[PDB]
Amino acid sequence: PSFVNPEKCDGCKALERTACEYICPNDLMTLDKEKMKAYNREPDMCWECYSCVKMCPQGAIDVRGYVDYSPLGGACVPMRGTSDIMWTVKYRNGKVLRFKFAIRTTPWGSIQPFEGFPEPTEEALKSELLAGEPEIIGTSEFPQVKKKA
């Protein structure tokens, strides 16, 4: 499960929103208004998806493998950028692996949902065609499927 490093956590300084609390798909990350530091409120409901880890601007969040099956010592640390993501995998035995994978081929926030699509029409609304079809499918026409004789 995830856990917050007190020394690095700043309860999200003056930004507009608490990153970890905002991103967690299972509503586990929250702030301790007293310490002004975050924590996982229900670790046995943590999917170890690393969303909080990746979005913490201070890199104050890490993941400690579930105790049920995890010997101590292993760690996976991501450094997510804009076009790629870097990973450092450290083994219990000291072994260290480093990888880097692409994550996006276009600028963030650049999506134009219906770019180049014609305007919808009442007539079109009655066909089987979705937005952009049949062009976006790549075929010479809307794909046909042979019905059982």
Binding site: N26, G65, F101, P120, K146, K147
Partner: protein
């Protein structure tokens, strides 16, 4: 187990209500929901319709794709953009055979003819697809393509946000019940929910509602019951919310007995698809036997399903189960032999495939890479253990449980249209209510691309439905107030009875969400073909399950919650309990064992194509508290041969 730091209690009458009026309401902002939001925004302009998306968490990373995915499991490729082209007829055949003969081919063929377009848009939007030097999409198996999908959800979330607008997206709002038309008992009129960030009750009034809540997990006890209870193979974030609210509204379910048992890397449940299909890894038992070979003959009794290619997943699981019952564990994924073979002595080639192997994990199930790190397992040196996880209920993956939905007018046979008052693509038997992704049954193998695609399909159908039928649902304020009281009842019960004990979690007058969940998991595990009995069950066990679920259901009326987080947990438990009951009743009804490997009815051990080659559909009547089941014979819609 949950131990809140401090109380966050509110009484229903102290909570302000926020009314939201929209035309199309999408419940769940995962892949199918985002697909619906995206497409709906396109056609909605025809009537100036308002589209609203409600999500319990944050759309940027919510749902099954929170960590990303290492591949798109459904890409037909009708032109040759990938290393392997396929036909729609072959795909439909593949899915029907994987379902051991039972699949709504009209629905499968429908998402299949649309899915490639969705994938092409994904790439357009920035998703990096693995490519060969020649520029071809890299194939994993026959139907999947590899992707650098760490940001798969964020990219899709952006497309949806750009399409519908952030002002139309409600996050951190948990939907717990649908609202029906006061003017019509079999029509939807909206839904109710509550915020998990503040005291606020939501009332969504809509002409069309689309269920996209994902499937259901944690119904069954996992193979790890401590912290690792959180390591469910399928999305722990999905708790059968759509199944609950839809069935309560009277929408018919189908194939709800069809659970999926994933055979994955042990404990961490890392993916095996790339290892099997791409790296050509072999799975062998403790003695070095490749059981897909030694157990091949045992599938001869499942003609012609056992002769299909690939072999049906449930049958592959069956071979695994036979090994487990014979005591031939551990079962190993020989990654070390796979990597050595593929590299062929080429050290640089090894480094390259080694990076690919780790990306396969780091792009979607980091826990497996973390497990290897903690256990000092280097895939190039030693094999890894694999095992089947507990059962999960969903309709987008290899499981086909979900609502019985209408198909396209050009493919759906008369045989399948009989139960729909209105014939709109992906609409349930409840007018105005649609189901997509995991929520739509009988048409599995949608996966990421297919779920988004199914959402697009339903969204266009929803706009058509609104503009054609021109509905004007009226919510029942009396029912709304009843639901508002029920919504915060757990908090009021906690405050009312907590003084009976010096310990908040040991009280004779209430159970906390985690306590009720532990109970549900034990019942399902022991009586509903869970891991406890190696997925076996029978009439008596299922009947006892219903008895124990009855007690639990009654005790839900005595649920308590200490804060908003736990209040959501309380309702997620309620949703899972009813999902569990439906699953049990469905397994009890089908007197055969069609999917050995997923579950076995020891009292009806054989597959019965003479009497059970049909979809099992059911409807729950909330007023009479009665379940009615029906058998809808399967008919081959698409042309194909074994």
């Amino acid at each position: 187990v949950y131990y809140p730091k401090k109380y966050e209690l509110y009484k229903a009458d102290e909570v302000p209500t926020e009314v939201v009026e929209t035309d199309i309401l999408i419940i769940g902002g995962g892949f199918s929901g985002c697909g619906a939001a995206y497409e709906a925004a396109y056609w909605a302009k025809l009537g100036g319709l308002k589209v609203t998306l409600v999500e319990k968490a944050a759309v940027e990373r919510s749902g099954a794709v929170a960590q990303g995915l290492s591949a798109i499991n459904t890409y037909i490729d009708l032109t040759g953009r990938s290393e392997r082209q396929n036909t729609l007829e072959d795909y439909v055949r593949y899915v029907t055979l994987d379902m051991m003969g039972l699949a709504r081919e009209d629905l499968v063929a429908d998402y299949a003819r649309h899915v490639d377009g969705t994938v092409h848009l994904f790439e357009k939007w920035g998703l990096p697809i693995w490519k060969t030097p020649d520029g071809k999409y890299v194939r994993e198996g026959q139907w999947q393509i590899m992707i650098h999908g760490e940001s798969y959800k964020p990219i899709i979330a952006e497309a949806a946000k750009m399409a519908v607008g952030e002002e139309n997206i409600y996050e951190r709002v948990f939907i717990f019940e649908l609202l029906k038309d006061k003017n019509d008992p079999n029509a939807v009129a909206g839904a109710v929910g509550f915020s998990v960030r503040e005291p606020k009750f939501y009332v969504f009034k809509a002409k069309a509602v689309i269920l996209a809540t994902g499937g259901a997990t944690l119904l069954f006890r996992p193979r790890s019951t401590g912290e690792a209870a959180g390591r469910t193979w399928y999305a722990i974030f999905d708790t059968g919310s759509g199944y609950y609210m839809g069935l309560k509204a009277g929408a018919m379910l189908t194939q709800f007995e069809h659970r999926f048992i994933p055979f994955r890397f042990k404990d961490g449940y890392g993916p095996v698809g790339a290892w099997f299909l791409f790296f050509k890894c072999k799975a062998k038992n403790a003695y070095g036997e490749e059981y897909i070979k030694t157990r091949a003959a045992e599938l001869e009794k499942y003609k012609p399903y056992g002769a299909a290619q690939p072999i049906p997943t449930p049958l592959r699981n069956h071979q695994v189960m036979l090994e487990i019952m014979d005591g031939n564990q551990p079962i190993y994924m020989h990654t070390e032999e796979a990597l050595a073979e593929l590299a062929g002595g080429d050290k640089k080639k090894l480094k390259h495939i080694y990076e690919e192997a780790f990306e396969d994990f780091l792009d979607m199930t980091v826990s497996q890479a973390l497990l290897w790190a903690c256990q000092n397992i280097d895939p190039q040196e030693q094999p890894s253990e694999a095992a089947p996880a507990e059962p999960y209920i969903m309709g987008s993956h290899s499981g086909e449980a979900g609502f019985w939905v209408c198909g396209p007018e050009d493919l759906m046979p008369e045989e399948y249209a009989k139960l729909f008052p209105l014939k709109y693509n992906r609409m349930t038997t409840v007018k105005g209510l649609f189901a997509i992704g995991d929520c739509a049954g009988a048409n599995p193998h949608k996966f990421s691309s297919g779920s988004f695609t199914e959402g697009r399909i339903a969204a266009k159908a929803a706009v058509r439905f609104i503009l054609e039928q021109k509905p004007n649902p009226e919510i029942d304020d009396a029912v709304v107030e009843e639901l508002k009281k029920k919504a915060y009842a757990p908090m009021e019960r906690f405050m009312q009875y907590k003084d009976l004990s010096t310990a908040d979690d040991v009280n004779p007058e209430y159970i906390l969400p985690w306590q009720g969940l532990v109970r549900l998991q034990k019942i399902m595990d022991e009586y509903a073909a869970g891991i406890a009995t190696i997925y076996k069950t029978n009439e008596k066990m299922l009947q006892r399950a219903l008895e124990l679920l009855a007690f639990l259901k009654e005790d839900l009326e005595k649920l308590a919650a200490r804060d908003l987080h736990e209040l959501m947990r309380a309702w997620e438990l309620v949703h899972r309990v009813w999902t569990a009951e439906a699953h049990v009743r469905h397994m009890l009804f089908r007197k055969e064992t069609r999917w050995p490997g997923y579950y076995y009815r020891t009292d009806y051990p054989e597959l019965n194509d003479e009497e059970w080659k049909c979809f099992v559909c059911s409807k729950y009547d909330a007023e009479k508290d009665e379940w009615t089941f029906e058998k809808v014979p399967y008919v081959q819609v698409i042309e194909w041969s074994f």
